[PDB]
Amino acid sequence: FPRVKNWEVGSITYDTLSAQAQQDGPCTPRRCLGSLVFPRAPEQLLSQARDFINQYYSSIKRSGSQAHEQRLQEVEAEVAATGTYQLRESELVFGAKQAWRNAPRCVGRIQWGKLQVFDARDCRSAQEMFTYICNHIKYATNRGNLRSAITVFPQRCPGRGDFRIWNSQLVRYAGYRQQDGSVRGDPANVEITELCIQHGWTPGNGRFDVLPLLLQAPDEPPELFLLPPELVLEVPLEHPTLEWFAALGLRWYALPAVSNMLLEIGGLEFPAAPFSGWYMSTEIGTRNLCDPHRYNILEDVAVCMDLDTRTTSSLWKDKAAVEINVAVLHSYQLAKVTIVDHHAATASFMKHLENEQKARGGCPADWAWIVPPISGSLTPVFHQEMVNYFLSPAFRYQPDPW
Amino acid sequence: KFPRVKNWEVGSITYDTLSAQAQQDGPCTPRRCLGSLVFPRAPEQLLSQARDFINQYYSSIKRSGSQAHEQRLQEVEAEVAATGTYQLRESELVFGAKQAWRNAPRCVGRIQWGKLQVFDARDCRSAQEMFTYICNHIKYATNRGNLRSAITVFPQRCPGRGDFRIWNSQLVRYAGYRQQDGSVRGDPANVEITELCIQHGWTPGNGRFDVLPLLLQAPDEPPELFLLPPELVLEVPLEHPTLEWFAALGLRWYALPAVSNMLLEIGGLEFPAAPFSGWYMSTEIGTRNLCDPHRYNILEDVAVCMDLDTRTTSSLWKDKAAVEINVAVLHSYQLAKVTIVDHHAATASFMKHLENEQKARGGCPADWAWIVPPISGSLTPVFHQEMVNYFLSPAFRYQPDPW
Ligand code: HEM
Ligand code: HEM
Ligand SMILES: N=C(Nc1ccc(CCNCc2cccc(NC(=N)c3ccco3)c2)cc1)c1ccco1
Ligand SMILES: N=C(Nc1ccc(CCNCc2cccc(NC(=N)c3ccco3)c2)cc1)c1ccco1
Ligand SMILES: C[C@H](O)[C@H](O)[C@H]1CNc2nc(N)[nH]c(=O)c2N1
Ligand SMILES: C[C@H](O)[C@H](O)[C@H]1CNc2nc(N)[nH]c(=O)c2N1
Ligand SMILES: [Cl-]
Ligand SMILES: [Cl-]
Ligand SMILES: [Gd]
Ligand SMILES: [Gd]
Ligand SMILES: [Gd]
Ligand SMILES: [Zn+2]
């Protein structure tokens, strides 16, 4: 049982939940790979299914009860008859919440109990997929009062291709390869922008052209779908005191809706299960706008602030980054779109760590992803030791469909 | 068999083949990663470590397999058989100290690892002579503000005789006076060593930046108190280039970061007293030492003076005040002509070190959480660089406090 220390306050906990870690991570006693982004039978399915049902009934205090045994026997027969089994709707809800709760890289898990689950397990085609997704975006956006939600499309099974959302998020800006090597738009989306074009999408030419969706029903080519503009809430970015900031033409979208991860529950796998919450401001103002391989606007902003950019020791990069994050917070609040700054969010995650210590003896957390990308040690999570391990149900990465 | 290592800014990929040579085990298992923890924690075992080190030495000078290489291996093996231990040649001590720095995974300044002045104090015999060696180190390294990296190696651990130890964690530390309330005047990180100084006879001050005396331990003796001559201790008064009230805070820091509580291990020999010094990266002072809530904790008072709105987190008053404190630190050291490096330049040079080491040794042990600076993390290139942490020897190691 690892000892976990907070170096700001001096408090000590012991992580007893890590003993129950399901799969194996990438580290060995010889070397730690904690900083890597991607860590490298019917009896197989039954064992995972049993552990999840036992989890679920323990969590509702029907532990070992009559309804517990009846569900266990039902799963056994279903797998024998068909090779898989079907979650009850309450189990699907519980499993989606647990998979969020178990995500080590998520700083927002104080919210894990409040999740809207849309059951799309009866979906039949890409057109129907598009309707579920539009319903999700509408519900989750809620005119800017964002609400967390997940839509669960049909599980994979043998003999049949998966449902897939080819886009990494529901809302993505195009990235256009230019004749001089550079990228106009978001460099992260250069591949999917080309995939949309190849599948017959008329490309824009702006830095913030919202991409169409490439949705894939089983064993069929993907279909392009245009998102109605009135459905995609965007926030033009302005600064509260730097009047020229508005004229940079920057904007970002309200709804972070991740669509390329796989949801795993009781040994079942959902390759299309988009989930959304709301943004932490550093995601937009630091990573998306200031990363050298994303919009990379830092030097542009520093020139407008008339900063000395020829020496690093004036900290022109730091001052411009902070004002971009100010602009993001100011612009979302003014537009009445839900957002949380990195101080508020890390303070809430500390409470989540405390709540989870009492709830189940620990909490899997990836320090490198929990600590914000600016002002790290100004937030309390910087001084918090953390233990990283993989519990199930879980969100996992998966290969691209193509 | 070798971990793939990716840089996400550039897209480039290497494989860390050096990790396969890791000589001691860390805290992680396939079940759970403990990389974020601060403390991750005999004749022919000595001999395998010694042989490996001699091999490293003869590799560095491109005489592997030479007669001199074989003869020195045989010489070490015969001394261990006779005495249970052995002595480093002078040249091996210099190489081993540099290698321990090169191997230190939490050090972002290792581009400098080949430039290290090594003072051989292995004939030191008393705490008084210890003090002379340390003062000479401080004078050399400080060099009136033009800082030079140096290490002084005191006698190795040996059976039947106690260790040399420097009780202070650094050669220059500000006192931390525990108040009756439980508050602290001065540096809270130094409350314990301050109380040990007073117990051993030091008359304490009552300032926020009182330089501590040294508690020096010779073998099998209680520690002995030595006052540093004030003119040996170069300090920098803190001011801001455009906020003139900042100078009225009365803040200062010292020029020379000289870590004195780590153990130097070379070829299985252990050196419990071997203080080493370089120069500061500005975030160490401006962000951690001055803005940590459990250190000097000045962030709110500076923000109030800047007339920022401290009642709401979303104004980012903490971020703005912290950046200006870092500006003050850099401006003040440059003004006083004391070597300092900012976190942008330091991490850029570390990236060049990673490329150097990938060609020289096929990898580089590095602790991401420690290499990424405490402000503006993703604005620096190391944020986007995957890293493999592992333990090589020669090494600098944590060791228990002598009391
Ligand atoms: C409610 C407000 C939420 C906030 C403020 C928040 C914040 C964050 C942030 C900042 C990250 C790091 C992402 C990155 O750096 O690219 C993250 C990751 C993650 N979030 Fe949350 N999140 C929220 C809700 C949710 C919800 C509702 C779910 C799922 C039901 C979820 C699941 C995840 C997962 C699986 C990751 C890891 C993603 C990856 O490794 O690529 N989050 N979150
Ligand atoms: C020359 C300029 C140098 C710079 C700018 C530099 C920078 C740094 C920084 C910023 C840290 C993290 C310190 C902390 O957060 O407490 C560190 C740690 C470390 N440095 Fe360097 N360093 C330099 C020279 C040296 C030298 C000369 C040595 C030894 C010969 C050394 C060995 C180490 C070790 C062993 C650590 C780990 C300390 C620990 O785990 O507590 N460094 N360095
Ligand atoms: N760049 C690549 N990989 C890669 C890219 C990004 C990641 C992590 C980013 N997930 C995006 C993401 C994930 C989770 C949360 C948010 N934000 C929220 N607030 C949110 C969404 C939903 C609820 O809350 C954003 C991991 C790997 C790449 C290129 C080629 C192959 O891979
Ligand atoms: N906090 C505790 N322990 C603890 C305290 C501090 C640390 C890390 C601090 N290293 C100080 C340090 C280490 C290395 C480099 C520098 N700087 C340089 N530039 C430099 C120096 C020499 C060459 O370059 C500073 C690790 C553990 C604690 C409280 C109670 C018991 O333990
Ligand atoms: C190499 C390193 O793991 C990578 O850049 C990580 C660091 N921490 C992160 N933290 C968050 N929240 N999101 C990220 O994409 C990353 N990227
Ligand atoms: C808990 C966490 O590991 C701790 O605060 C670490 C993080 N990274 C660090 N990085 C550096 N350079 N110095 C430190 O003291 C720490 N502290
Ligand atoms: Cl995003
Ligand atoms: Cl320090
Ligand atoms: Gd102007
Ligand atoms: Gd330039
Ligand atoms: Gd002024
Ligand atoms: Zn690890």
Side-chain angles (χ1 to χ4, degrees), chain A residues 19 25 27 29-32 35 37 40 286 291-292 312-313 318-319 323 341-343 373 375-377 385-386 388, chain B residues 3-4 20 22 26 28 30-33 36 38 287 313 319-320 324 334 342-344 374 376-378 384 386-387 389:
Chain A
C27 297
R30 297 193 64 93
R31 76 292 180 279
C32 170
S35 74
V37 172
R40 307 281 168 259
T286 309
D291 271 0
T312 53
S313 55
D318 313 69
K319 304 158 118 306
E323 294 313 321
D341 72 68
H342 52 286
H343 305 296
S375 297
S377 71
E385 293 180 339
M386 296 172 197
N388 195 1
Chain B
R4 186 183 78 90
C28 301
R31 324 193 89 272
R32 80 289 189 278
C33 167
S36 81
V38 169
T287 307
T313 58
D319 317 71
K320 297 162 122 293
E324 289 316 316
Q334 290 163 356
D342 68 68
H343 51 289
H344 299 293
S376 291
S378 68
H384 312 280
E386 289 175 356
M387 297 179 196
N389 193 6

Side-chain angles (χ1 to χ4, degrees), chain A residues 83-311:
Chain A
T84 183
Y85 73 103
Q86 245 56 50
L87 298 164
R88 301 181 168 168
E89 201 169 71
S90 58
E91 301 164 345
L92 172 77
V93 167
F94 169 81
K97 282 176 180 186
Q98 290 297 118
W100 178 10
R101 178 192 197 185
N102 292 340
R105 287 169 172 184
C106 176
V107 69
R109 291 176 272 167
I110 198 64
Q111 287 287 323
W112 75 264
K114 188 184 175 186
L115 179 64
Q116 184 58 59
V117 177
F118 292 115
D119 178 3
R121 284 173 305 158
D122 20 6
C123 192
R124 264 158 285 98
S125 74
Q127 174 60 259
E128 189 172 358
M129 222 189 310
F130 179 70
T131 305
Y132 275 116
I133 287 172
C134 291
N135 282 327
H136 180 140
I137 294 168
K138 167 258 177 247
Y139 172 95
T141 303
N142 184 31
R143 323 263 270 284
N145 185 16
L146 271 45
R147 299 178 285 195
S148 300
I150 190 182
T151 301
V152 184
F153 286 107
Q155 59 215 256
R156 99 183 0 157
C157 51
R160 167 230 228 178
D162 300 353
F163 283 89
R164 286 300 290 273
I165 309 177
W166 282 34
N167 306 62
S168 70
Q169 291 188 29
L170 296 187
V171 193
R172 301 261 75 200
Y173 295 124
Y176 304 113
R177 161 78 45 246
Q178 294 298 284
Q179 194 60 228
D180 73 325
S182 61
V183 165
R184 187 166 174 86
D186 197 336
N189 306 323
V190 174
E191 187 166 23
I192 180 64
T193 297
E194 276 147 13
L195 289 192
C196 293
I197 289 171
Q198 292 190 6
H199 286 64
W201 176 58
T202 285
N205 56 17
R207 300 138 81 201
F208 302 100
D209 302 333
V210 178
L211 282 169
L213 298 174
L214 274 172
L215 313 179
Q216 179 190 260
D219 293 306
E220 297 266 347
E223 253 169 77
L224 269 183
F225 285 94
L226 276 299
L227 283 177
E230 112 254 46
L231 226 67
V232 189
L233 184 56
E234 290 178 273
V235 178
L237 299 180
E238 74 165 26
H239 188 282
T241 56
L242 296 171
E243 307 185 5
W244 49 258
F245 198 98
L248 292 177
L250 305 169
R251 48 211 278 115
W252 206 258
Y253 51 88
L255 188 68
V258 171
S259 49
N260 61 0
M261 299 188 74
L262 180 140
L263 167 59
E264 186 256 296
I265 304 166
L268 307 178
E269 302 177 325
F270 300 88
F275 60 83
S276 70
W278 52 82
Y279 268 115
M280 180 167 72
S281 49
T282 50
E283 303 180 69
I284 307 168
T286 309
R287 301 306 309 281
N288 298 347
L289 296 174
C290 296
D291 271 0
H293 53 292
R294 302 290 303 281
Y295 278 82
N296 187 27
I297 72 169
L298 204 52
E299 196 174 357
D300 293 313
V301 176
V303 165
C304 296
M305 300 172 65
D306 301 303
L307 301 179
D308 183 9
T309 61
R310 74 191 172 268
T311 182

Side-chain angles (χ1 to χ4, degrees), chain A residues 45 57 164 188 190 378 391 393:
Chain A
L45 180 54
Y57 277 91
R164 286 300 290 273
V190 174
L378 307 190
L391 298 174

